């Protein structure tokens, strides 16, 4: 059960670690801060000038009062194109709307007139991928100036299949539906349209609107009434316990991560500051010590963790496959804390198969530097800033190789929101391939 | 127990003590409480006409004899019982309008029929009211409205028994059990 | 959300409307009042004379203390035969019995000795139809003098299939089981028999009784112990909310309905006085304005309404089909508020198919004068008195073309009891035919 | 009754003479021989759809055959019976 | 409903009955008391000497504080072999562990060094049979000195199939894993091993251990953390009511049973002292009076009882088959109170088929002297001491023909724990064979 | 072991879904474990594995249930002592002799 911390908060080697980390968390807070302006206060003023709410103003009004919002991939497109395309011009994230956790996707009209750059499409899709896999109703705040005036459509395909699967699709048009865009609302179960403001160019004339609104505020109010009538019930079943905080403070995580990549540390100190009551029941602690494995709870949600603590060797691969076999048997979500430092394959296979076939929801956080990320399709994949020019978290995060860079001191909160979003969907039983014994 | 009331004058103590006897109920046994209520409320006792033969003297007024209870009563008892018996809320469907002890009927008036038995007597009170009013019940108080006069008395439910305050005497009421007795 | 009423209660055009309506509600209360006597105080006295409880006295004793009772088709047979056959000599209705909502069906021995006239059979069956579709346990209070001394059997067939489907069948014989009747208890999982009083003519000699009773009171007491051991669980799943009353009084509905058939009115004023908190979220308010469609809640139960507001045109048919598509997707019950005033069929088809195939429970109330009633098999079908000699609600209601004429000021209560009865059964997912695009 | 009512395999009925009874148990089809039984004449019922027609006794085998085969377009459900009153 | 007792507690014929009964309950308490020592205070001291907890000390430490424990077959092997083999050297029983009801099976190392005698195997299996049928996670406290140095393996087969069915298998090795034994932990999802104390002879060298422990106390503590992460949910569905005690005292049961086998009594007096509120709703009280049948509740759990009250005749067989048909329809557990005192088969068949095919959980208690015990595979089968040298409860109980002899005054408690254990598993719907009408 | 074997056969008949045909002819369940047998007949019948009994001798003691517990029983008349067609009520087909019986 309960973990004892060997980390000295008031030490100097510590402050050094917290030094570079806080340093990075702050680089991030700044960039995001920038990214928050879309196309500069320039375009933003122009937009507010036309009497329209900004994409993020819409998102905050649509949400339930005080609701958390889990923004997905904000570093999208960063330093990828010629100029800037803040967050690829689309703001995605999960938030509560009339008690239901919804996938919200809005076009930032103030970024190239909300025109889909390749990565804009990739991100819009990525959001749906998430909305489908986790059974999250969708709300698209449409406002776009093209699909690039000077890949898509797949988008509509998604709207149709989710609608077919009972995952309600809602469109709110508060701007232009240029080119493709026009289908986004066409392809939604319910569309809210802004009248005499929102240029509908390629209610009862477009025949793609089921609710008409005076302004952006009215529109979002209606969009809320829409979600209000989804008669929604979550399908994920689990033995949730009442939440219990970790014994040590969140921020201490900054000090835990050695400032030097080489300098080995015990990942257990990272787990101890994420899980409930800091209780971690380790599995085969003396075997495959390179892979730490154990059970725990996070915000009352039972999870099975696997964190890298060195190089993956045979015994580790086995340890790991056995552990995932356990988790799937019991229908417990999987937490992968990845930091990949660096005959063999015979056993690595077993791990692969376990990780590949495991059907419970999986979550992955890169906290360091086989297995690997988007390769196993985890519900979400986040990266800590300290993780690794062409290897910078910003590099990948900017190309949707993950769902964003997050604050280490918030990992527990993020994993919690995620686990819960995931629970909207059922937890399938698992079938594994032929394990190469 | 011993009930003691103090007052500035003797009428005060008496009137207060009397109120303490009104607000006291005891069921499951026979009690000298109805008796005591009468004593304090006896003209002889107010006038202080005391001597050690007082009890055996006014016995006729102190120890009356029952009067079967009026249809005035059964309606009251029924309402009371019916209202001490909610309706079963099922976890299946918690707000089901089917849980109403209402008596709701389609176009006609609310119908509720109860097989009650007080003491060694039994009536089949049939409650009808196209007028939702009449009686209500909060805590241990039955609030009745006999057209114009809103009065309130004790009605306490303990187990399968409903103890109703009627004319300064606690009456135990319960539902008739066709099976129990047939046996 | 919230509806604003344009109806003036203290107006004169109003009182006029409330005039003819209250007038009719009272005609009804009287007829029923009559119908309540079965075969007159004559036969009733004779019956009580033999020491027997009357059919309605039995029904009230069987029920849970204070329980509502939803009588079905009381106007059955009215002015259909030679003389009178009050309620066709059978009293049907849904009521609570040991916390379970049950379909109760009793023979009024005081109406031609409780002899099945054609409509008596039609009604007995109709009750079972309801008991099957809504998974309501059955309790038959048997007491009959024939199947007509001077169509049936289908009845037993029903007992067998419901029994097979796990919908418990209970018989309580408190009289004669003449002709067919003898099978009614034979065909029930459990039969309660009255001894030395209830002539069993075509316990252990009829071999059709599992419980013996001294008298009608003992019998019904036993019948209660029967339902007490059904180990019953309702199967309908829904996001029920705690009930909230409508902003305006029930009775105001009398004034809303124009006294003149022609004189058009907004049906939304009818909805506003039925749904919870008077909140109605309308769908496509500006398209097919002849068909009002929206979501709401009634006694905490989420419903999707469709009310006629004129003649059904193309756009309306479409509007409607789309809306029902939504409701089925979400598993929300359907409320049809029908008042049918009066190339085309291409779209009407879509509506038909949606309405025909929709598998959620459907409820219909005729409040005025394609689509149409018993054609789409709604769980129940009720008529307001103002609705339309051979077109009088009494005409149809008397021939089981509907489940009864109800008080407009009680529609919310009736729909509520109904919706809940319906919930004993699951809510099937929907499959639609080929929509003629 | 229960056996006949609940039986889910296809059922066919032919009236060849004069409980149980016809349309009461919902057989896939119901035919009547002419010799079967004014208000009781096969024509009476047959004319009011109480059955699917009057057929030639010498063809019953052929009719039952076509029917059985038509029936086979649909699956043959497994059966669940009610509580048999032992 | 409510039963009236015709039993006079302060009578003399009574005290006579209570006389022989209490007499027997005490013979039992003594033998068990003996059996509790395993291999005498001799071996027990030797064992505690080696610093090890005794099998029953382990069982009590493993359990949740204060938890009841339902020991299975303690009279196992009694007077079957040469010398003694207390409880066949294995202590089995159901108990709470981290809120989960688990099947615990431990080797009494102090009985022939915990060596499997034939009946030891039979009992170990019997425990699993129960663990499978009732979906009870397993915890094996391993400590054995052989499979007989001077049938098995089936055991491992069971471990595999339960593991496959999601019924978690846990091994705790606190001693020797001689011969077969070595596979017991090998075949478990999770094994807790005691280091430098528990001779592992046929963690990472046996490769059969996933948790290492300093001592027996540490081990059992870990075993608890194991069950703590089973993410367990019970699957039995029932309309449980809050528990209500029987009107008469438990002990009065001693007086009820005539001291003489012949002397007939009403079994209803036995039911009245077991069921909640003493309410028993009898079915067909006047038919087949030799077989009493009715519904009731026990610790809020609804049950359908069938108790022998004489010789089984035709009408009884029928009565019984009909009743079980009812119970299965409703998914109510069956309680068989058997006391078998002593053309025909035509009807007995029906009963057989009903009893054989009924798929709800079945429980049987022999309280006296076709049908019969282990023949119908009831979840459990217990015997009262008064029941019937080669016919003595000890005879059978010692050869696993039942799960133990229990105190009549505790039957209600035992049936309650059992019913609840059973509820870990779902309640299958029933399919009956062809009833010979 | 007779019981053990009879059961073993059913175990096989169940697991492999093999219809059963019991040729009954017994003089006891030992005049000077069983019943489980009938339990099996019921469950296989329930699973749609048809149970057939052919009594060509004695149905002593338990035995009497074997045919009772079968979907269809063929009985030999005036030869096969039925001691513990329409009097035992456990027979659905009557036969003159063993050859007729097996033919049925």
């Amino acid at each position: 059960a309960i973990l004892h911390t060997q980390i000295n908060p008031r030490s100097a080697e510590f402050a050094a670690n917290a030094a570079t980390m806080l340093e990075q968390v702050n680089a991030l807070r700044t960039l995001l801060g920038r990214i928050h302006e879309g196309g500069g206060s320039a375009a933003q003023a122009r937009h507010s000038a036309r009497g329209k709410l900004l994409v993020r103003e819409r998102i905050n009004r649509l949400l339930d009062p005080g609701s958390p919002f889990l923004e997905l991939s904000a570093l999208a497109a960063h330093e990828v194109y010629g100029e800037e395309v803040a967050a690829a011009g689309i703001v995605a994230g999960i938030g509560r709307v009339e008690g239901v956790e919804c996938m919200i996707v809005g076009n930032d009209a103030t970024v190239k007139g909300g025109t889909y750059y390749p990565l804009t499409v990739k991100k819009h899709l990525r959001a749906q991928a998430i909305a489908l896999e986790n059974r999250l109703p969708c709300i698209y705040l449409v406002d776009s100036g093209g699909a690039n005036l000077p890949h898509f459509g797949r988008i509509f395909f998604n709207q149709a299949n989710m609608s077919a699967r009972g995952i309600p699709q809602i469109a709110v048009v508060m701007g232009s539906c240029t080119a493709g865009g026009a289908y986004v609302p066409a392809m939604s179960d319910e569309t809210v349209m802004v009248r005499e403001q929102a240029t509908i160019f390629l209610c009862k004339v477009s025949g793609v609107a089921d609710h008409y609104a005076e302004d952006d505020d009215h529109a979002l109010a209606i969009a809320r009434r829409c979600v209000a009538n989804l008669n929604w019930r979550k399908q994920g079943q689990l033995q949730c316990r009442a939440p219990r905080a970790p014994l040590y403070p969140a921020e201490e995580l900054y000090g835990v991560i050695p400032a030097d990549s080489k300098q080995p540390y015990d990942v257990r100190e990272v787990i101890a500051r994420l899980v409930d009551g800091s209780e971690f029941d380790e599995f085969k602690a003396l075997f495959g010590t390179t892979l730490v494995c154990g059970f725990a709870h996070l915000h009352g949600y039972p999870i099975a963790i696997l964190a890298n603590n060195g190089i993956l060797f045979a015994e580790a691969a086995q340890k790991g496959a056995h552990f995932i076999e356990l988790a799937c048997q019991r229908g417990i979500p999987l937490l992968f804390l990845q930091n990949i430092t660096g005959g063999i394959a015979k056993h690595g296979a077993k791990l692969v198969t376990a990780v590949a076939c495991a059907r419970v929801p999986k979550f992955t956080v890169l906290i360091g530097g086989g297995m690997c990320g988007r390769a196993y399709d985890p519900r979400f994949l986040w990266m800590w800033p300290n993780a690794r020019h062409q290897g910078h978290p910003y590099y990948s995060s900017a190309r949707l190789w993950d769902d964003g860079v997050i604050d280490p001191a918030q990992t527990r909160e993020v994993l919690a929101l995620a686990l819960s979003a995931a629970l909207n969907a059922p937890i399938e039983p698992t079938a594994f391939g032929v394990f190469r014994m | 127990a011993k009930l003691i009331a103090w007052g500035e004058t003797r009428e005060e103590a008496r009137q207060r003590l009397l109120a303490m006897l009104a607000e006291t109920s005891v069921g499951g046994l026979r009690t000298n409480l109805a008796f005591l209520r009468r004593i304090l409320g006896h003209p002889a006792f107010a006038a202080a006409e005391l001597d050690t033969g007082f009890i055996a003297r006014h016995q006729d007024d102190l120890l009356p004899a029952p009067q079967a209870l009026p249809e005035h009563f059964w309606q009251a008892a029924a309402e009371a019982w019916l209202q001490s018996e909610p309706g079963h809320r099922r976890d299946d469907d918690p707000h089901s309008p089917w849980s109403r002890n209402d008596g709701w009927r389609s176009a006609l008036a609310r119908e509720s029929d109860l097989m009650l038995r007080c003491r060694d007597e039994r009536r089949c009170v049939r409650l009808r009211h196209a007028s939702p009013s009449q009686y209500r019940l909060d805590g241990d108080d039955l609030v009745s409205r006999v057209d114009g006069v809103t009065r309130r008395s004790a009605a306490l439910r303990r187990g399968r028994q409903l103890f109703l305050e009627w004319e300064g005497e606690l009456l135990a009421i319960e539902a008739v059990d066709p099976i129990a007795e047939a046996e």
Side-chain angles (χ1 to χ4, degrees), chain A, chain B:
Chain A
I2 315 270
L3 294 163
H4 296 309
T5 193
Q6 316 286 54
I7 274 167
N8 190 183
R10 276 130 74 187
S11 162
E13 164 185 55
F14 181 91
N17 300 328
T20 29
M21 191 53 86
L22 181 44
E23 189 176 306
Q24 312 174 70
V25 183
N26 281 306
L28 180 61
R29 298 206 179 67
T30 313
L31 178 37
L32 295 177
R34 196 189 210 293
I35 289 169
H36 245 63
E37 303 211 310
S41 47
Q44 291 207 183
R46 291 161 45 196
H47 186 97
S48 292
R50 305 183 176 50
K52 295 160 63 150
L53 288 179
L54 293 169
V55 62
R56 292 177 190 277
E57 307 203 73
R58 306 176 148 164
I59 284 181
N60 276 24
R61 267 270 175 55
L62 165 63
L63 292 180
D64 288 336
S67 166
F69 176 59
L70 191 66
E71 179 168 359
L72 294 166
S73 285
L75 305 181
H78 191 65
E79 309 191 325
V80 159
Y81 291 130
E83 60 263 316
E84 321 204 296
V85 186
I90 209 162
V91 183
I94 306 159
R96 273 288 182 76
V97 180
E98 295 289 347
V100 176
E101 298 111 24
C102 304
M103 176 52 89
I104 298 168
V105 176
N107 314 106
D108 187 329
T110 91
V111 184
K112 270 57 250 294
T115 287
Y116 285 64
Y117 273 75
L119 284 212
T120 308
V121 159
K122 199 132 164 300
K123 177 171 171 171
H124 184 144
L125 291 176
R126 175 53 205 162
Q128 304 186 123
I130 291 178
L132 174 62
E133 280 164 19
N134 296 289
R135 181 164 185 269
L136 307 180
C138 298
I139 299 175
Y140 311 97
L141 313 178
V142 184
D143 196 340
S144 56
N148 214 308
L149 314 190
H151 286 56
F152 217 102
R154 176 81 212 178
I155 292 191
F156 314 146
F157 173 78
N158 297 337
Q159 277 169 82
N161 291 319
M162 289 173 99
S163 179
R165 310 227 174 156
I167 295 161
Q169 304 295 276
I170 303 167
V172 178
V173 184
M174 312 145 107
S176 30
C177 23
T178 299
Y183 271 98
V184 161
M187 300 291 299
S188 308
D189 313 328
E190 279 190 278
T191 287
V192 191
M193 178 85 282
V194 185
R195 253 181 328 186
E196 51 261 14
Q197 191 217 79
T199 56
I200 293 308
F201 65 94
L202 290 159
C203 288
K204 321 163 292 176
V205 179
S206 263
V208 145
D210 322 287
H211 299 296
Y212 45 86
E214 305 198 320
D215 57 68
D216 280 31
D217 236 288
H218 190 192
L220 297 176
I222 284 177
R224 287 185 60 85
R225 301 312 307 155
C226 283
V227 180
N229 297 285
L230 293 168
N231 189 30
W232 196 257
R233 174 171 297 189
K234 305 181 70 167
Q235 289 172 16
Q237 240 80 298
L238 269 186
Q239 298 315 293
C240 320
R241 316 232 268 224
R244 293 159 67 244
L247 299 196
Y248 320 103
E251 16 294 306
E252 285 195 1
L253 274 166
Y254 298 146
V256 182
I257 295 293
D260 187 309
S261 279
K262 307 297 182 168
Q263 187 177 177
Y265 69 118
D266 180 6
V267 69
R268 292 184 185 70
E269 298 289 323
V270 180
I271 296 171
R273 303 186 156 71
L274 296 174
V275 315
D276 285 11
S278 297
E279 324 181 354
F280 172 81
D281 295 307
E282 184 159 2
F283 172 77
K284 289 196 179 273
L286 315 174
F287 188 68
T289 51
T290 0
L291 189 52
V292 178
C293 294
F295 289 115
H297 278 67
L298 191 160
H299 216 281
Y301 305 126
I303 57 189
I305 311 177
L306 284 81
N308 277 135
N309 218 182
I311 293 68
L312 196 70
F313 293 87
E315 310 210 312
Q318 286 151 52
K319 191 205 210 239
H322 182 176
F323 185 65
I324 291 160
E325 271 189 288
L326 289 186
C328 290
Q329 183 199 231
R330 310 172 183 179
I332 306 169
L334 287 171
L335 182 43
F336 286 86
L337 289 171
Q338 179 178 306
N339 164 182
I340 186 56
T341 310
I344 161 61
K346 186 298 195 63
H347 302 293
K350 300 187 214 306
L351 187 53
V352 173
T353 298
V355 191
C357 306
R359 290 287 297 253
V360 290
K362 287 166 293 194
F363 306 83
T364 296
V365 167
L366 304 185
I367 60 182
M371 205 166 90
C372 208
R374 225 121 226 198
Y376 292 132
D377 261 332
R379 295 299 176 78
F380 299 83
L381 166 57
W382 294 284
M383 273 188 50
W384 272 13
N386 71 173
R388 280 305 165 291
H389 162 64
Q390 303 179 62
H392 184 38
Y394 292 27
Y395 192 62
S396 82
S397 252
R399 295 172 176 57
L400 300 216
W401 291 7
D402 62 75
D403 303 309
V405 184
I406 50 107
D407 181 355
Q410 286 178 144
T411 312
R412 172 209 170 68
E413 306 173 304
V414 175
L415 290 198
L417 298 169
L419 232 172
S420 191
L423 295 174
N424 277 262
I427 288 177
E428 330 301 354
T430 290
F432 292 115
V434 166
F435 278 116
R436 186 162 266 299
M437 293 314 187
Chain B
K2 289 147 65 177
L3 293 76
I4 295 84
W6 145 281
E8 272 169 6
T9 105
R10 172 172 192 273
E11 276 302 275
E12 215 135 295
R14 191 182 64 76
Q15 294 230 266
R16 280 174 164 183
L17 181 52
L18 208 124
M20 297 180 33
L21 297 191
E23 299 170 44
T24 285
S25 308
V26 176
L29 293 190
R30 282 167 302 187
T31 285
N32 80 335
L33 181 71
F35 175 74
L36 306 161
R37 283 153 170 183
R38 277 176 261 260
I39 293 185
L40 303 184
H42 196 300
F45 176 94
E49 340 228 72
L50 312 151
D51 75 297
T52 62
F54 185 92
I55 220 64
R57 176 183 314 150
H58 312 81
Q59 58 188 312
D60 300 343
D61 309 295
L62 296 180
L63 296 165
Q67 303 204 209
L69 317 153
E71 169 70 17
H72 190 69
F73 161 85
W74 296 97
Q75 262 280 317
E79 284 296 1
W81 175 273
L82 184 54
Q83 260 158 284
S84 78
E85 290 249 302
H88 189 305
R89 301 168 61 69
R90 7 177 55 254
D91 298 309
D92 285 72
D93 154 41
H95 304 297
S96 191
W98 290 102
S99 288
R100 269 138 106 291
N101 44 181
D102 226 49
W104 185 101
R105 290 293 186 273
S106 199
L108 302 174
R110 286 155 175 36
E111 284 143 44
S112 304
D113 292 24
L114 305 180
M115 257 308 290
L116 306 180
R117 184 270 282 182
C118 175
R119 286 172 175 175
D120 267 271
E121 146 98 287
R122 66 188 63 191
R123 266 300 179 188
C124 176
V125 178
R126 203 153 293 149
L127 303 179
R128 308 314 175 76
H129 44 291
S131 55
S133 54
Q134 282 294 63
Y135 307 70
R136 71 176 183 170
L137 167 92
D138 54 295
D140 296 319
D141 302 292
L142 189 72
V143 179
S144 62
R145 286 177 68 184
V146 178
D147 49 276
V149 184
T150 293
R151 189 178 280 81
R152 62 167 62 226
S153 70
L156 292 102
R157 241 278 197 172
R158 259 47 162 188
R160 76 100 141 203
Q161 255 174 161
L162 172 50
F163 297 96
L164 175 49
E165 171 209 306
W166 195 256
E167 313 293 282
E169 207 171 65
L170 203 71
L171 294 163
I173 303 148
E174 32 187 278
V176 176
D177 183 358
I179 291 163
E181 68 202 10
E183 313 198 304

